[PDB]
Design a protein around this ligand. Sequence first.
Ligand SMILES: NC(=O)c1ccc[n+]([C@@H]2O[C@H](COP(=O)([O-])OP(=O)([O-])OC[C@H]3O[C@@H](n4cnc5c(N)[nH+]cnc54)[C@H](O)[C@@H]3O)[C@@H](O)[C@H]2O)c1
Ligand SMILES: NC(=O)c1ccc[n+]([C@@H]2O[C@H](COP(=O)([O-])OP(=O)([O-])OC[C@H]3O[C@@H](n4cnc5c(N)[nH+]cnc54)[C@H](O)[C@@H]3O)[C@@H](O)[C@H]2O)c1
Ligand SMILES: OCc1c(F)c(F)c(F)c(F)c1F
Ligand SMILES: OCc1c(F)c(F)c(F)c(F)c1F
Ligand SMILES: [Zn+2]
Ligand SMILES: [Zn+2]
Ligand SMILES: [Zn+2]
Ligand SMILES: [Zn+2]
Lengths: 374, 374
Amino acid sequence: STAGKVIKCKAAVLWEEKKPFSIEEVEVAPPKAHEVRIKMVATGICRSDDHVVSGTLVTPLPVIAGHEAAGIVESIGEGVTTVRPGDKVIPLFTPQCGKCRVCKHPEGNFCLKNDLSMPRGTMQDGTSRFTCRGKPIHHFLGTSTFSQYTVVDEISVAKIDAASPLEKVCLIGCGFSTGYGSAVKVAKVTQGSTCAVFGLGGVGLSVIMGCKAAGAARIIGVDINKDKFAKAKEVGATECVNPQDYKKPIQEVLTEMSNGGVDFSFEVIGRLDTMVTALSCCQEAYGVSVIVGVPPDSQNLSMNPMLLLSGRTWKGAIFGGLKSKDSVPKLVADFMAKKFALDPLITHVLPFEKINEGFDLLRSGESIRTILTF
Amino acid sequence: STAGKVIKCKAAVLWEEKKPFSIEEVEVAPPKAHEVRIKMVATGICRSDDHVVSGTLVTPLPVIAGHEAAGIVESIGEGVTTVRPGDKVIPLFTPQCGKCRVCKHPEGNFCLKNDLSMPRGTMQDGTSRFTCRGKPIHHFLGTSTFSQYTVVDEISVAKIDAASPLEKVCLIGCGFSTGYGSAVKVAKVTQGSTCAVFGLGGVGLSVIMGCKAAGAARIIGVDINKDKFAKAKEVGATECVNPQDYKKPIQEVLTEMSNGGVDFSFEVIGRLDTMVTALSCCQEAYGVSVIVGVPPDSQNLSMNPMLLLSGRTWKGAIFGGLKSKDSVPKLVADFMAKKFALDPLITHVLPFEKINEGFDLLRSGESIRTILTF
Ligand SMILES: NC(=O)c1ccc[n+]([C@@H]2O[C@H](COP(=O)([O-])OP(=O)([O-])OC[C@H]3O[C@@H](n4cnc5c(N)[nH+]cnc54)[C@H](O)[C@@H]3O)[C@@H](O)[C@H]2O)c1
Ligand SMILES: NC(=O)c1ccc[n+]([C@@H]2O[C@H](COP(=O)([O-])OP(=O)([O-])OC[C@H]3O[C@@H](n4cnc5c(N)[nH+]cnc54)[C@H](O)[C@@H]3O)[C@@H](O)[C@H]2O)c1
Ligand SMILES: OCc1c(F)c(F)c(F)c(F)c1F
Ligand SMILES: OCc1c(F)c(F)c(F)c(F)c1F
Ligand SMILES: [Zn+2]
Ligand SMILES: [Zn+2]
Ligand SMILES: [Zn+2]
Ligand SMILES: [Zn+2]
């Protein structure tokens, strides 16, 4: 009955930086050609969504944020072939168009159709599907999951198993896949190796899971919030360190602990200083450091390139380096087969209408992932 | 016989920064246990030796520099097993102790016994074998090849083919192996790829050689000195560009030429700016950039980590990533089997006594490699 019609629904609109979300009525246009309209079921609160609020991440406002989610297709536009009404789906904040030089490359994932590098806050066609108070509202990363209904381009959605528990698998849309992939695919963590993980939130925990799955012998968690250590150990950390406890810089501490530097390090926070610290702590001749955290907009880091000349490898990735549309359904299948766990990441559950409380929990340090249910 | 005796011989002593080498008599002590005294036959002038003169590289002075060379063993200390008097050898500025965690690592080559990171300018035992005018003179990288005789630790010397032409294979001691290995081993250049090489001196030409040997389809040379272009093309560059010819930054030019970024880039100059430019010009999702050049002491670069977050890989290496004592004899064997050419690197051959004139040729832009013959 709603196919081809505008849907009025509730969404969490961010009108201004540094302000609460406003849960209010929006109008969601029907899908155009090669677009998919989704009834949201669950969405996680990721720190990158908070970055939009804080201005760490710059994207056009006003906006409907949210990028870690799962739902059910309500309708499809003309020409859509990869999903149908009633399918369970995960929106893909990194698209997979399948046609660009990155999508065709054996390793790359950062499809050239992404709306991350130079955000416009639109659909692929440069327009918006959202109206609120009579005003157009921007999209976020082509996903905009903080709404009872969203519209996404086909290249930004993956069909997943029909029996999937959406209130769990939404985490495959960002935090789990990013961390796990960053360890297994990007870093290529080896059996017997020593890893250091900076930041023990949902993504860092997922990095630890990946390092443990890859066979690391030592996984050293690093966080300034010691309350994060117990869960990090539960998912595989062998030791945890708080930089605030030490007189020496933590790169020196980690070098000492690893008898000359770690094999793999990960920055999973979003600070320039910890990006350089994490590079430094990996072994100077053969270490690898991966940047996962999102730094503040337009700010440069300073480093000595001798850190690299000796032999270190430095890299970053979006979404764990995973080709999104290929990988998401496989990860859901593997979850269903108990190949990895998601429950350790979920510390709180709230209805969507309590989104602001969910952000308060993240900001206070108390939560890992809060899952919002529509 | 000279064995067991102090040798008085000619060497090029650097008494202070930014002055000519002084060609004069030095005393060379006999080798102690696990040391090798070598009669030099040929040594190349590498830009890294000029960095000692210019203060770009800090190492204790006064010093006998030189690190790219070949000669013949005059005598061995107690306990030496890997070379014998009369053997042709190449000194190894990056040692291979075989025992440290780096030597045991499948990939690493920057042996922990090196004298690069924190130079002492001595033998492994913390003493010097050189005196001049009654004063102790420092070693350089455990090699000190700007002397008719030097003494090196066993871990810093490789035996090579007895039939080798030492006036050519001395380049395997630094410039050829560095560039070639940086392409083939460190970057792992792939067949059909597009490469950009910043700096078309001896090392950059060797990077071209390696990119061509790895099957690159396009190899774009970049230099401010257009006189370098003809030789770059002879050894495999498909195109050359001079940044001075353009009104836009060269990373933009290279991104446009490569239809969105190169597969592999190499910084083979030693400037902070060109290191960031080289990284930027590689494709944002899957590009790899390798730092080869040596930058000025204690200077940090500035860069936006979004260049890495999108998926680039940034790395550096010493000596092409090659395990030195394993690799050098194999490279010489490969040269003797006509697997690569060295002649294109050699533009001048001078007696040792003309060392200063050789450095002047380098500084004026007129030479690639000058080989000094003893
Ligand atoms: N690359 C990607 O695709 C991608 C995907 C998802 C998240 N992100 C980013 O990854 C980062 C982590 O996200 P998250 O796990 O949801 O965030 P989070 O739950 O806020 O976790 C960050 C952790 O860092 C800790 N921390 C803060 N400062 C320091 C410090 N100075 N030293 C050590 N620990 C510190 C903090 O206590 C917290 O536990 C954020 O910057 C995200 O924006 C990137
Ligand atoms: N990593 C290693 O193990 C290693 C080994 C050997 C050499 N090096 C370094 O590698 C670098 C090159 O050595 P080399 O080939 O003997 O030196 P070289 O022969 O002086 O060549 C350098 C080239 O860079 C060119 N150049 C200078 N400025 C620019 C610019 N702004 N943009 C483009 N081109 C420019 C210059 O014209 C010259 O052709 C030096 O910094 C060495 O110290 C490192
Ligand atoms: O959490 C994933 C995520 C990122 F990794 C970004 F780089 C980004 F800009 C963003 F908006 C985002 F949501
Ligand atoms: O040319 C090789 C070379 C280097 F790569 C250095 F990093 C260095 F410090 C040095 F002295 C040197 F000779
Ligand atoms: Zn694509
Ligand atoms: Zn996220
Ligand atoms: Zn070693
Ligand atoms: Zn050199």
